[PDB]
C-alpha cells in the first residue's frame, strides 16, 4: 500500500507492469488463486536503484493472509533470487492459498537488492472461512505428509521450555541458598568464601555434568528421528527467459518505436501533455490505446470502448488522444498525447515536482484494426507548469 509515498520518477522508470490478473477475488480458507502478469524492465535504469541483476518476486500482502504455494518468473520456479535484464520483459505468476478471513489488498511485488521494493498493481481479495481450518500440507522426500501450519512447533517447545525452566530453577536456587543483600555484605566484609565454597562447587560440577549429558542425549535422539537432513538451499537462480511473444518491446520483425520529445505536467494538477515521435514499423495501421506508468492505466476510450476488468484505483479512461488517425504502416509521426485523470494526482505521480529527476517513464500500447497489440517504451524529461 506504500507505493503512493515512493518517489514518482522511480516508480515510472523501473518496472513497467502489464497484464496483471487475479484468478479470483474471493476465496475460501484453503482455496488456491493465482496472481499473474508481465513486467518490463525500463531501458534507462535509474542510478538510485542498483542494477536488478539480483531481484525477488513477491506477493505484496499484509503478512501471510494468503500462503504463497509457488511462484514463477522468466519461465522458472522462483523461490530464490533471480536476474532481470534491463530492457527485457518477463512473465510471472504466484499461486496464493487463502489463510486469514478478511478483505486484503494483494500486490505484485519485486525487490531489487541494490534498491528495495517496487510495488505492482494490487487488488482486494476477500477470504472466507476460519483460520482454524487452514492447513497446508507438504510432501517430504521420504513420501510422508506434514502440515506446515503446525509441523515442528511441538518439538521446539519441548526443547525450549524445559531449558528455560532449568535456567530459572538455577537462578532461584542461588538466590535462595544465599541472599542478594547477604552475599553482598559477606563479599564486602571480607568473606566471600562464606558465599561459595565447595560443595557449592560440587553442585555446579554436577549440574554441568547433567547439562552436557542432556545435550549429548538430545542431540543423538534428534539424530535418530531425522537421520537425513540437508543445508538450507540458497543462491541466485540461472538466467531467466524473457517474453518473446510477439510483441513486446524490441522483439520480432514488426514493432512501434516511440521517442518522447517534450512534455509538460501541471503543478498542482491532474494533467500531462507529451509529444511522441512514433514510427511503425509494423505492416498495420495503429491507433494508440493505452499508456501504463506505475501500474496505472490510462486508456484511449476510442480504442477501449469496453473497458477492462482491472482495479478501480488504477484504471483511467482519459489516456486520450490520437486523432484516431492510425499512422502507418511505415509512417513516422509526431503526435501530441494528453494524459488527464484524478488518479495521476491521487497516486502522487504529480509529486514528480518534488523529485530529484523530473522525468517520465512507461509503456505505450498501440492497437491494430483487429486485436493485435504492439507495445513501445516511452520516457524522458518532462517540465512542470506552475499553475495557481
Partner 1 sequence: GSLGWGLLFYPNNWPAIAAFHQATEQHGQLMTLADLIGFHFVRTSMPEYIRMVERGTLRTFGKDVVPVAAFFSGFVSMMVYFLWWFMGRWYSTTKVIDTI
Contact residues for Cu ion, defined by CB under 5 A: 1, 105, 122
Minimum CB distance to its own copies, residue 238 (Å): 3
User: What grid cell was written down for 258?
Assistant: 516511440
**Up-side HSE of residue 264: CA atoms within 13 Å toward CB?**
7
Name the segment binding its own copies (CB under 8 A); options: 22-30, 237-245, 330-338, 365-373.
Answer: 237-245
Query: Binding partner of residue 117 among Cu ion, partner 1, its own copies, none, CB under 5 to 8 Å per kind?
Result: partner 1
- 48 is a contact residue toward its own copies (CB under 8 A): yes
Query: Binding partner of residue 105 among Cu ion, its own copies, partner 1, none, CB under 5 to 8 Å per kind?
Result: Cu ion
The CA distance from 116 to 181, in Å, is 54
Q: Of 31 and 357, which CB lies nearer to partner 1 in the complex structure?
A: 357
Q: Which of residues 323-382 bind its own copies (CB under 8 A)?
A: 353-358, 379-380
Q: Of 64 and 381, which CB lies nearer to its own copies in the complex structure?
A: 381
What is the per-residue binding string for its own copies in 74-113, x denoting contact by CB under 8 A?
----------------------------------------
Q: Of 116 and 162, which CB lies nearer to its own copies in the complex structure?
A: 116
On whether the CB atoms of residues 107 and 59 are closer than 8 A, the answer is yes
Report how far Cα 126 is from the mean position of its chain's Cα atoms: 20
- 230 is a contact residue toward its own copies (CB under 8 A): yes
Query: Binding partner of residue 122 among partner 1, its own copies, Cu ion, none, CB under 5 to 8 Å per kind?
Result: Cu ion
Minimum CB distance to Cu ion, residue 117 (Å): 12
**CA distances to 57, 128, 281 from 253, in Å:** 31, 48, 8
Tabulate helix, strand, coil % of the chain (nearest 5).
20, 35, 40
Residue 266: Cβ within 10 Å count: 18
Q: Of 119 and 375, which CB lies nearer to partner 1 in the complex structure?
A: 119
Minimum CB distance to its own copies, residue 162 (Å): 30
Phi-psi region of 87 (alpha: psi -120 to 50; beta: other; left: phi over 0): left
> Which residue of 138, 236, 332, 342 would you call a contact of its own copies, by CB under 8 A?
236
Name the segment binding its own copies (CB under 8 A); options: 20-28, 38-46, 98-106, 195-203.
Answer: 38-46
Helix (H, G, I), strand (E, B) or coil at 92: strand
- 138 is a contact residue toward its own copies (CB under 8 A): no
- Backbone torsions φ then ψ of 345, nearest 5 degrees: -70, -45
- 383 is a contact residue toward its own copies (CB under 8 A): yes
- 70 is a contact residue toward its own copies (CB under 8 A): no
Minimum CB distance to partner 1, residue 201 (Å): 15
The CA distance from 356 to 348, in Å, is 15
Name the segment binding its own copies (CB under 8 A); options: 40-48, 168-176, 179-187, 329-337.
Answer: 40-48
Minimum CB distance to partner 1, residue 300 (Å): 26
Phi-psi region of 291 (alpha: psi -120 to 50; beta: other; left: phi over 0): beta
Which value, in Å, is the radius of gyration of the alpha carbons in the chain?
A: 30
On whether the CB atoms of residues 50 and 112 are closer than 8 A, the answer is yes
> Which residue of 116, 179, 197, 239 would you call a contact of its own copies, by CB under 8 A?
239
Strand 76-77 to strand 287-292: parallel, antiparallel, or no bridges (unpaired)?
Answer: unpaired
Beta strands (DSSP E) in the chain are 15-22, 26-28, 32-41, 55-60, 66-73, 76-77, 89-98, 102-112, 116-128, 138-139, 145-146, 255-267, 271-281, 287-292, 297-299, 315-316, 332-340, 359-367, 373-381, 383-386
For its own copies, the binding residues (CB under 8 A) are: 43-44, 46-48, 141-142, 228, 230-239, 267, 353-358, 379-380, 383-384, 386
Amino acid at each position: 500500500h506504500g507505493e503512493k509515498s515512493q518517489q514518482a520518477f522511480l516508480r515510472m522508470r523501473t518496472l513497467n507492469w502489464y497484464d496483471v490478473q487475479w484468478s479470483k477475488t474471493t476465496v475460501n480458507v484453503n482455496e488456491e488463486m493465482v496472481l499473474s502478469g508481465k513486467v518490463h524492465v525500463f531501458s534507462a535504469w535509474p542510478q538510485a536503484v542498483a542494477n536488478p541483476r539480483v531481484s525477488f518476486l513477491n506477493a505484496g500482502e499484509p503478512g501471510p493472509v494468503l500462503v504463497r504455494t509457488a511462484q514463477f518468473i522468466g519461465e522458472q520456479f522462483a523461490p530464490r533470487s533471480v536476474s532481470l535484464e534491463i530492457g527485457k520483459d518477463y512473465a510471472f505468476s504466484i499461486n496464493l492459498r487463502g489463510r486469514r478471513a478478511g478483505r486484503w489488498h494483494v500486490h505484485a511485488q519485486i525487490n531489487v537488492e541494490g534498491g528495495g521494493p517496487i510495488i505492482g498493481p494490487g487488488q482486494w481479495i476477500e477470504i472466507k472461512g476460519d483460520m482454524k481450518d487452514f492447513t497446508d500440507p507438504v510432501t517430504l522426500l521420504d513420501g510422508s505428509t506434514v502440515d506446515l501450519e503446525h509441523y515442528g512447533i511441538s518439538r521446539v517447545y519441548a526443547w525450549h521450555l524445559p531449558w528455560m525452566a532449568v535456567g530459572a530453577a538455577w537462578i532461584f536456587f542461588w538466590f535462595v541458598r544465599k541472599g542478594i543483600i547477604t552475599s553482598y555484605i559477606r563479599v564486602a566484609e571480607g568473606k566471600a568464601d562464606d558465599v561459595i565454597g565447595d560443595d557449592d562447587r560440587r553442585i555446579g560440577a554436577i549440574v554441568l555434568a547433567l547439562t552436557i549429558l542432556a545435550t549429548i542425549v538430545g542431540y543423538a535422539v534428534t539424530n535418530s528421528t531425522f537421520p537425513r537432513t540437508i543445508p538450507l538451499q540458497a543462491g541466485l537462480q540461472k538466467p531467466l527467459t524473457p517474453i518473446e511473444t510477439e510483441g513486446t518491446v524490441g522483439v520480432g520483425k514488426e514493432n512501434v518505436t516511440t521517442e518522447l520529445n517534450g512534455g509538460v505536467y501541471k503543478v498542482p494538477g491532474r494533467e500531462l501533455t507529451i509529444n511522441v515521435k512514433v514510427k511503425n514499423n509494423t505492416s498495420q495501421p495503429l491507433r494508440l490505446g493505452e499508456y501504463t506508468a506505475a501500474g496505472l492505466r490510462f486508456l484511449n476510450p476510442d480504442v477501449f470502448t469496453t473497458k477492462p476488468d482491472f482495479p478501480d484505483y488504477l484504471l483511467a479512461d482519459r489516456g486520450l488522444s490520437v486523432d484516431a488517425t492510425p499512422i502507418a504502416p511505415g509512417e513516422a509521426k509526431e503526435i501530441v498525447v494528453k494524459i488527464q485523470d484524478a488518479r495521476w494526482d491521487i497516486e502522487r505521480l504529480s509529486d514528480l515536482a518534488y523529485d530529484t529527476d523530473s522525468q517520465i517513464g512507461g509503456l505505450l500500447f498501440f492497437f491494430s484494426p483487429d486485436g493485435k497489440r504492439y507495445a513501445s517504451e516511452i520516457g524522458g524529461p518532462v517540465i512542470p507548469k506552475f499553475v495557481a
